């Protein structure tokens, strides 16, 4: 069941003006643990992991919670942002 | 030993003009060398304030056109005029040039005639004139 | 009132709006020195002095979204104030500005540090390297569409007079863009000779560049001069040359990740041990300290000369090593004077003490020790026999005999504080090996 074109545009404006996600204590420990493991891996030398990767994981976790209209970031929203960043930095489907 | 040479550059020898002979350049061309940050740029800023017609230019900031005579135009008559450069406006003083080693190849060839006959011969756009410097 | 409006001033022109059958304004009445000494502003300055520890409070209040780099933020505080402009009566104008350059791998938030000092300074202009060529950096000679006169439009080094010039990507700049930079860091002037306009404009700005390595990351196997595409002439004019290396560490990455998540959650800084200073009150403390001109003391002049000898001797012995830095140029000696004079302005003192000289010399040693590791070992607490051997070397220096009858060395040990029983055991030990 695919959503129509005009119905997809209304979901973006309504979620970006009424739902404000917040970082919980459970989602912080997942991002911190995933950020330290990426900088310590020897296979991540193809792309320089700087301070932008720490802010990119928080922006992707907050944008994922806006789709489900949730005001809190759980552990499910942190696993999607971690898998999306590993595919763009390493290039392999883990 | 460095200040004793610059003092003689401000005075300089006389100009024994000849009628049937060539013109001899009586100026003193001094060139400073060595490691930088040794009060080299401060000397060029002090001679300019003493000489009434001294100028201060850089190496890459002035090519072979800014030192000679750039063909400018008047903003009143809209005609092709000839404006003097850094080497022509200093008729009687000391010219201070910074970063002499950072000059282009087209600019170093023009100074060969200024340090010998003290004349700048420009032949561009059908205008072959000799400027005295 | 004619012949009184200078190009580049911010005044309040009062007049009448009369049309012309075009609309003109008939003139009727017409920086850091324009702020008056208001009683309400002076009360806010004294509130920060009585609180105690003003040097460390303003050093941590800048850039609340950047964790770490305590020594890097300390040099940015003195850049807003600066030294004194001692004008010699002979005709020499000593430059009082500080030239600080930030280096390292592009990941220590270099773009955030350049924009933080631009919003704080009232006359700061931020620019890049490739986006601003030689025309946008110096001055553009455009044509007037009315009077048809060749004017001089101010660029980045002209509009930011008496302020801080923020330049991004100093390594990706062209060769024609470093011409005016060499003149500002030496004479604070811009030599323009285009379109028949041979005028010189003053540029008393604070250049704060940010270089980047050519190979992206830093290479410890290569020399520091070859890793950065910058000549040695530009490094001699810069006073402080930092090098923030991105060293992977589990302790530094854990504290940095927690500070980032706290900013993107509460839109504020984490609670520390002091209240953050608002940028509206920080400008009042910097402008008030610029009016005070501290004078160098006579007792502190001997410590500056002795520090320059030890600094020049260490750089000469490291010329053939792997960490071969720049030569001990005389420009580096004047940088310590400008840093020590700027530290006295924050303490509201007209005389430079010994603490200001040691604090200024510490910032230079930190930027130079960024290449070495944090492994320092020192041990000097062995048996007291070595201290007694130093007394025997004094007798051999004046004479040089290894006789057994020693009647003058015993009189020197008693004046020190050692006992006579332990002295007999040290002489017999050295006499066995014939020393």
From Swiss-Prot, chain C:
Main location: cytoplasm
Annotated EC: 3.6.4.12
Additional information: Present with 166 molecules/cell in log phase SD medium.
Protein's name according to its UniProt entry: DNA replication licensing factor MCM7
UniProt-annotated binding residues for ATP 2: 237, 331
Subcellular location: Cytoplasm; Nucleus
GO cellular component assignments: chromosome, telomeric region; CMG complex; cytoplasm; DNA replication preinitiation complex; MCM complex; MCM core complex; nuclear pre-replicative complex; nuclear replication fork
Assembly: Component of the MCM2-7 complex. The complex forms a toroidal hexameric ring with the proposed subunit order MCM2-MCM6-MCM4-MCM7-MCM3-MCM5; loaded onto DNA, forms a head-head double hexamer. Interacts with CSM1 and MCM10.
Residues that coordinate or bind ATP 1: 67, 107, 109-111, 212
Alphabetical GO biological process terms: DNA replication; DNA replication initiation; DNA strand elongation involved in DNA replication; double-strand break repair via break-induced replication; nuclear DNA replication; pre-replicative complex assembly involved in nuclear cell cycle DNA replication; premeiotic DNA replication; silent mating-type cassette heterochromatin formation
SS bond list: none
Record's function text: Acts as a component of the MCM2-7 complex (MCM complex) which is the putative replicative helicase essential for 'once per cell cycle' DNA replication initiation and elongation in eukaryotic cells. Core component of CDC45-MCM-GINS (CMG) helicase, the molecular machine that unwinds template DNA during replication, and around which the replisome is built.
Catalysed reactions listed for this entry: ATP + H2O = ADP + phosphate + H(+)
Coiled coil regions, renumbered to chain: none
Domain MCM, first and last residues per copy: 54-261
Highest taxon of the lineage: Eukaryota
Gene that produces this protein: MCM7
UniProt family annotation: Belongs to the MCM family.
Motif Arginine finger, chain ranges: 236-239
A GO MF term: ATP hydrolysis activity
Keywords: ATP-binding, Cell cycle, Cytoplasm, DNA replication, DNA-binding, Helicase, Hydrolase, Nucleotide-binding, Nucleus, Phosphoprotein
């Amino acid at each position: 069941k695919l959503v129509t074109i005009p119905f997809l545009r209304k979901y973006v404006q309504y979620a970006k003006e009424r739902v404000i996600p917040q970082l919980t204590q459970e989602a912080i420990n997942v991002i911190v643990k995933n950020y330290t493991d990426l900088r310590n891996d020897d296979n991540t030398k193809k792309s320089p992991i700087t301070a932008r990767t720490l802010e990119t994981l928080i922006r992707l976790a907050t944008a994922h919670a806006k789709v489900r209209l949730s005001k809190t970031v759980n552990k499910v929203d942190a696993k999607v942002a971690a898998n999306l960043l590993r595919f763009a930095l390493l290039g392999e489907d883990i | 030993d460095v200040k004793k040479g610059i003092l003689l550059q401000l005075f300089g020898g006389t100009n024994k003009t000849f009628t049937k002979g060539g013109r001899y350049r009586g100026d003193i061309n001094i060139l400073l060398c060595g490691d930088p940050s040794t009060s080299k740029s401060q000397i060029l800023q002090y001679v300019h304030k003493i000489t009434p017609r001294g100028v201060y230019t850089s190496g890459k900031g002035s090519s072979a056109v800014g030192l000679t005579a750039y063909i400018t135009r008047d903003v009143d008559t809209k005609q092709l005029v000839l404006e003097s450069g850094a080497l022509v406006l200093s008729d009687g003083g000391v010219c201070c040039i910074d970063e002499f080693d950072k000059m282009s190849d087209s600019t170093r060839s023009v100074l060969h005639e200024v340090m010998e006959q003290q004349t700048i011969s420009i032949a561009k756009a059908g205008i072959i004139t000799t400027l005295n410097a | 009132l004619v012949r009184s409006l200078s190009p580049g001033d911010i005044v309040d022109v009062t007049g009448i709006f009369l049309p012309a059958p075009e609309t003109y304004l008939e003139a009727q009445f017409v920086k850091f020195a324009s702020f008056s000494l208001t009683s309400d502003v002076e009360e806010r300055v004294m509130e920060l002095i009585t609180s105690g520890d003003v040097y460390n409070r303003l050093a941590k209040s800048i850039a609340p979204e950047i964790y770490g780099n305590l020594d890097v933020k300390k040099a940015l505080l003195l850049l807003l104030v600066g030294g004194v402009d001692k004008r010699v009566g002979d005709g020499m104008k000593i430059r009082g500005d500080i030239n600080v350059c930030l280096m390292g791998d592009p990941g220590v938030a270099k773009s955030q540090l350049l924009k933080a000092i631009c919003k704080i300074s009232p006359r700061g202009v931020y620019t890049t390297g490739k986006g601003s060529s030689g025309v946008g950096l110096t001055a553009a000679v455009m044509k007037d569409p009315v009077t048809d006169e060749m004017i001089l439009e101010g660029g980045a080094l002209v509009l930011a007079d008496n302020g801080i010039c923020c330049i991004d990507e100093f390594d990706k700049m062209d060769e024609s863009d470093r011409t005016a930079i060499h003149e500002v860091m030496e004479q604070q002037t811009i030599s323009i000779s285009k379109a028949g306009i041979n005028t010189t404009l003053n540029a008393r700005t604070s250049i704060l560049a940010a270089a980047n390595p050519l190979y992206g990351r830093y290479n410890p196997r290569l020399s520091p001069l070859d890793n950065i595409n910058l000549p040695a002439a530009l490094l001699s004019r810069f006073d402080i040359l930092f090098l923030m290396l991105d060293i992977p560490s589990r302790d530094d990455d854990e504290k940095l990740a927690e500070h980032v998540t706290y900013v993107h959650m509460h839109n504020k800084q984490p609670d520390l041990d002091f209240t953050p200073v608002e940028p509206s009150k920080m400008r009042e403390y910097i402008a008030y300290a610029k009016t005070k001109r501290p004078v160098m003391s006579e007792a502190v002049n001997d410590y500056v000369v002795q520090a320059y000898i030890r600094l020049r001797q260490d750089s000469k012995r490291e010329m053939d090593s792997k960490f071969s830095f720049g030569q001990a140029t005389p420009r580096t000696l004047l940088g310590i004077i400008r840093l020590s004079q700027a530290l006295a302005k924050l303490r509201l003192a007209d005389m430079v003490d010994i603490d200001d000289v040691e604090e200024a010399l510490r910032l230079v040693r930190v930027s130079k020790e960024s290449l070495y590791q944090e492994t320092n070992k020192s041990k000097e607490d062995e048996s007291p026999t070595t201290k007694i051997f130093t007394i025997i070397k004094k007798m051999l220096q004046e004479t040089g005999k290894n006789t057994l009858s020693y009647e003058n060395i015993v009189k020197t040990v008693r004046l020190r504080g050692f006992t006579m029983l332990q002295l007999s055991n040290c002489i017999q030990e050295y006499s066995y090996l014939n020393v």
